[PDB]
């Protein structure tokens, strides 16, 4: 009965690291998307 809790605490730490990395990737993608949309809008505006 004394090893299950070790297993769960290790799993929780790994999940925290995972969500940290995923948040970094998400922020990068969000900035890229905003930049692309703004560039597309400006390009469409200039062509008229």
């Amino acid at each position: 009965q004394s090893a299950r809790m070790v297993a769960m605490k290790a799993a929780t730490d790994n999940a925290g690291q995972l969500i940290k990395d995923l948040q970094l990737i998400y922020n990068k993608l969000r900035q890229a998307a905003i930049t692309q949309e703004i560039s597309e809008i400006v390009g469409g505006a200039a062509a008229v």
């Binding site: 799993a11 990737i25 993608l29 890229a32 998307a33």
Partner: protein
């Protein structure tokens, strides 16, 4: 038994309010069986489904980190 100390050892022993104890021990049997079944259900539901569901899909996002669309 001896004049200074008294000790009786029993393999199975309980207060004999009646000539039988099966009707009392069956309650403990039901409690143990129920606790075992609920514990198995809790372990299965908490671990097998949840961890697999979390690990189901993670690479389709990692592979697209540097994308610029």
């Amino acid at each position: 038994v001896q004049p200074h100390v008294v000790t009786v050892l029993a393999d199975t022993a309980i207060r004999a309010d009646n000539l039988d104890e099966a009707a009392i021990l069956e309650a403990r049997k039901n409690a143990e069986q129920l606790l075992a079944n609920q514990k198995s259900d809790l372990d299965s539901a908490a671990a097998l489904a949840a961890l697999a569901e979390t690990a189901a899909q993670l690479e389709t996002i990692r592979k697209i980190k540097n994308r610029a669309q």
